DNA sequence: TCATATTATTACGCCAGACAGGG
DNA sequence: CCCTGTCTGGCGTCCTCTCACCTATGA
């Protein structure tokens, strides 16, 4: 399938997403160190050995993801700063998410 | 694809102990090789010298 | 290597081995069904110069 | 067009199958037909249950074999293949069939 | 007396060089100096059928067989003929024609295109079959039944644990 | 998408090493 | 046959950093 932008994010907890907004996208002023979040990304893992639950959680929410692999974007090891501009730019036919 | 240049029952598996087909993941379970892909599940390091 | 666009810049090596497994397919299916000898003999330095 | 026949005994399970099928291929198809129920089977039995006699005296059983027939109006390229990892649950024998 | 010489094209544009050479003779009009033109034949598609459709027919390696004559003239009408390389022979100077005892054996297995062959085959369960037709296109499995009176093998897309058993046909699917 | 298979520029500077030519 | 122009191959500095750009075809 395809990735994922939003912030419901596996393996972070309230530190790492606290410079994040509610759709993955840092903030526009946040002023980052070297190595936090700045576009939190997930992509597609899999069932493989799907159990009881896993598979009761294949057929309750209906998303099959599920845990994902983190591909989030980070600050290379550093470098300061502030962000000052976000772009995003959108292939035609995709769903725009809030910040979008 | 089977069996051009880069091919995994000349030249073995992509994955360690990862067979093609998969069929043997156990470590109780090595050295027997497979019979749907006909890969022997060992290591992908054999794919830098066959 | 994959350039993460989509496709893959090969190396020239798997260029050369496809050249001269084409070339070489190819004269074994000349061989054959029995092409007239000028053609194999063109199909021969073919593969001679891959 | 895709048809899917799910069979089970139980029919909250088989329910429970048919709704996962249709996600699977909503997401990445389109115009899943639905989850059409046919007719359950109730295959019946009575047996003597006395160890030597008494005729009269008898335990009626049956086994309600349930049917949901969902069907794939369009197969894609991703949608047919997606199947193949998704396996359901168990005790719910499914049966794709394409045209 | 016109005799055969073989000609040597970019390979795939080849039915453009026959006509691009088709028109070359009719624009300088030595009419007299070409017969024909031969090209990709043979067609046999993939395995057996007896029905239309299938194509995917190709024999003719890049090669373009001319029925001609041997002046300078009309070899360099031939080498001016976009597309071309040149001729395939001993030398450049005299290039070379190719056969003849070989013409009257290739004459007959010409006349025998359709008439009595198609030899039968064979199979068996093991070790798995290919599908590159229809939505099981891309996918592997097993015959675990091979129906020789309706030509039809039992093969389950085989998914790892419990798969469901189709039928394809031989052209449908690769041994 | 899945096999088909190679053509219309020149403008370094020695320095060895092998080769056809000729008194 | 021993000089001889002439032609063909084979060299040509290490280390590092930034950026962009990547085969056509096709019923």
């Known amino acids: 399938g395809p990735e994922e932008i939003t912030a419901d994010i596996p393996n972070v907890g309230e530190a790492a997403l606290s410079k994040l907004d509610e759709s993955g996208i840092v903030y526009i002023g946040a002023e980052v160190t070297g190595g936090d979040i700045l576009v939190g990304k997930v992509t597609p893992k899999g069932e493989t050995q799907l159990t009881p639950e896993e598979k009761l959680l294949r057929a309750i929410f209906g998303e099959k993801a599920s845990d994902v692999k983190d591909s989030s974007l980070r600050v290379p090891n550093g470098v300061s700063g502030t962000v000052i501009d976000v772009q995003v730019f959108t292939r035609d036919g995709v769903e725009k998410d809030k910040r979008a | ?50 | 290597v994959p350039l993460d666009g989509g496709r893959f810049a090969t190396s020239d090596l798997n260029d050369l081995y496809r050249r001269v497994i084409n070339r070489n397919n190819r004269l074994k299916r000349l061989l054959d069904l029995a092409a007239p000898d000028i053609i194999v003999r063109n199909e021969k330095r073919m593969l001679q110069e891959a | 067009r895709i048809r899917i026949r799910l069979k089970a005994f139980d029919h909250r399970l088989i329910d429970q199958a048919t709704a996962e099928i249709v996600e699977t291929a909503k997401r990445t198809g389109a115009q899943v037909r639905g989850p059409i129920p046919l007719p359950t089977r109730k295959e019946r039995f009575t047996v003597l249950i006395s160890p030597h006699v008494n005729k009269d005296a008898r335990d009626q059983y049956e086994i309600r074999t349930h049917l949901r027939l969902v069907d794939i109006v369009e197969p894609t390229e991703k949608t047919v293949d997606a199947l193949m990892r998704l396996d359901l649950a168990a005790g719910v024998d499914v049966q794709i069939s394409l045209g | 007396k016109k005799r055969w010489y073989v000609v040597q094209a970019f390979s795939g544009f080849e039915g453009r060089v026959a006509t691009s050479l088709r028109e070359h003779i009719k624009l300088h009009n030595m009419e007299d100096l070409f017969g024909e033109v031969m090209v990709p034949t043979e067609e046999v598609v993939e395995i057996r059928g007896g029905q239309r459709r299938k194509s995917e027919r190709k024999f003719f390696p890049g090669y373009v067989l001319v029925q001609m004559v041997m002046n300078d003239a009309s070899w360099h009408l031939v080498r001016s003929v976009p597309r071309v390389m040149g001729f395939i022979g001993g030398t450049s100077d005299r290039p070379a024609p190719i056969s003849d005892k070989e013409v009257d054996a290739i004459m007959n297995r010409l006349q025998q295109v359709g008439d009595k062959p198609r030899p039968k085959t064979l199979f068996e369960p093991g070790e798995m079959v290919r599908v590159n037709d229809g939505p099981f296109a891309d996918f592997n499995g097993v015959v675990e039944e091979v129906d020789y009176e309706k030509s039809r093998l039992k093969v389950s897309v085989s998914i790892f644990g419990r798969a469901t058993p189709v039928e394809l046909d031989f052209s449908q699917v690769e041994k």
């Open chain 2, 1 to 50: 694809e089977r069996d051009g240049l880069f091919c995994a029952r000349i030249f073995g598996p992509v994955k360690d102990y990862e067979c093609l087909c998969g069929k043997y993941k156990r470590l109780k379970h090595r050295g027997v090789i497979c019979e749907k892909c006909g890969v022997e599940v060992t290591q992908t390091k054999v794919r830098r010298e066959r």
